[PDB]
Amino acid sequence: MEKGTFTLKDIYKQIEAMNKMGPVRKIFEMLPFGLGLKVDNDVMEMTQEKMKKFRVIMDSMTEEELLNPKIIDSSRIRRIAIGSGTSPQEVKELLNYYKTMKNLMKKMKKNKLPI
């Protein structure tokens, strides 16, 4: 139905906690010219914190889409991944995360007693 018990749009907002977005003035305070294995970030994009790219796709995908995950449109997510900069594969695992939810079935409290 229109409601899917706490849709996933409620999950992406929880990651907003981290972002560090606000380059006002003096982003860094002086730096050593002899950097080592600290990061060495280069022109090639790199990945690390999964939560960092989690929020980005939150404003990409359509809320209507979040309400109905079963509507996985391979074409719609294609363009969307480009907007987020990641890819459909990273969104496929994201849904696969709720697969883990099936693991909940190991506990499946429910009731198991209609009468």
Which fold, 1-115?
434 Repressor (Amino-terminal Domain) (1.10.260)
Domain residue ranges of the chain, discontinuous segments joined by +? 1-115
Experimental method: NMR
3-state secondary structure the chain: CCCCCCCCHHHHHHHCCCCCCCCCCCCCCCCCCCCCCCCCCCCCCCCCCHHHHHHHHHHHCCHHHHHCHHHCCHHHHHHHHHHHCCCHHHHHHHHHHHHHHHHHCCCCCCCCCCC
Instruction: Give the number of other CB atoms < 10 A from CB of residue 94.
Output: 19
